[PDB]
Structure formats: C-alpha cells, structure tokens
C-alpha cells in the first residue's frame, strides 16, 4: 500500500540520492521552491520519506544540503549570455525565474556529489545555522 | 549522449514544448531555426539533423515524423525565399499524418 512514514537517516539519505540518480537524477536543473516541494512529495509518496529534511545552505556559492547522506548541492550557474538567451527563453520556456528570488541574486542548479558522503560540509563550514 | 531524432522522441520533445510557452505563434527566422537546434542538441543531445521544412510556398510541413510542428502564413495586407511571413503551428494529426513526405516526395 501506502508506504508508512519515516524520516531521512544518514544511510536513507544515500540511497535515496542514488534512487534519483537511476531514476535520470537531477543534474543540471533549475532550483526553485516549486521544485523543492515537488521532490519533497515524490520521495514521501514513492519511499515515505518525512519530508522535513531537504534543506540548503544560504551562502553565496554552493549550497550545501543540511541532511548529511544527500548527495545533491545546489550551485550556481553561471552567467547566461544576454545573446541569446533571453531569445532562446521567448522561444521555449517563456516562464521565468527572477534570479532575486535567491537573497544573493544567484541562480542555483542541481549537482550530484558523491564526497558529501565523506564530509558534512553543511555543518563542519556552517554550524551557526543549526 | 548525442542520440538521433526518433518518432516518439519527436513526439515527446513536441508535447513537452507546447506544454510550456512553446513556439506557438511565434514569428520564423532561420536564426530561431538553429537557436531551437542548439536548445535540443544542448538539453537532450538530439544530432541536430531534424528539422528540416518544406520548400515551397505556404504551408511548410516538418521533414522528420513525429515532429508535431509546422510552419504557417500570416496574412498582413525579408527572409522567405517565396515572400511570407511564417509562424510556428503546433499540429497533432502530424502524428498519424507524414505530410511532408506525402505532398512533397520530391524533397526525399
């Protein structure tokens, strides 16, 4: 049925970040809040996951995912040549984030990274936010 | 990965395109031509040796199957060799249909 609740362990969060790997991953997309909740309920509904644990960062540059076992940090990407990707944006996806909506003006993507096994860069960099 | 234009991936790439703004409407240039080349050569490795349109004047028809866009006048009362303005269409029946192929062999 319904697969019952249980939250993020250090070995959940491994293997769920492999689970979205196999499943095409999430390199290179866009980060956004919209997407944010989206992954939050993918991984409650398909592996009831408590979804109280996807959390970044805040700094300029990386941002560093705060449950240790997670394997994807956001980083920015950088500058979109003003030709042409604002043509290309019309053509395609005319929906656009304001990159303002991130506190440092950056853009943030996805990135897969298999070291943040072996290093809690959030809390050894960061502790003050915990 | 570069991975060849196929049927359902034109499909799919056609969906997921007109599912968000799209090209809908939007005015044809050979420039936006190659620009949604590299888009689809850069965000799915797709070779890009599959758009092509056909020749003639009026309605030009898309020469890979499954690819669900086509390209039509505008009427007003230059860049097209017949003297029309052109604007991308999406087109469902161009699944079931191979237009370019039927009306225009001669272009294979």
Do not use: C
Not at 77 to 82: A, P, R, W
Not at 95 to 120: C, H, I, M, N, R
């Amino acid at each position: 049925p319904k697969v019952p609740l249980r939250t993020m362990s250090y070995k959940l969060a491994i293997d769920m970040s492999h689970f979205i790997k196999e499943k095409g991953g999430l390199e290179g997309i866009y980060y956004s809040a919209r997407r944010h909740r989206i992954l939050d309920i993918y991984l409650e509904k398909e592996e009831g996951i408590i979804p109280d644990w996807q959390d970044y960062t805040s700094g300029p540059g990386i941002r560093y995912p705060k449950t240790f076992g997670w394997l994807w940090k956001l980083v920015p990407v950088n500058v979109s040549d003003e030709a042409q990707e604002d043509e290309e944006h019309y053509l395609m996806h005319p929906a656009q984030t304001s990159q303002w909506d991130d506190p440092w003006g950056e853009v943030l993507a996805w990135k897969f990274d298999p070291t943040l096994a072996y290093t809690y860069e959030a809390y050894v960099r960061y502790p003050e936010e915990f």
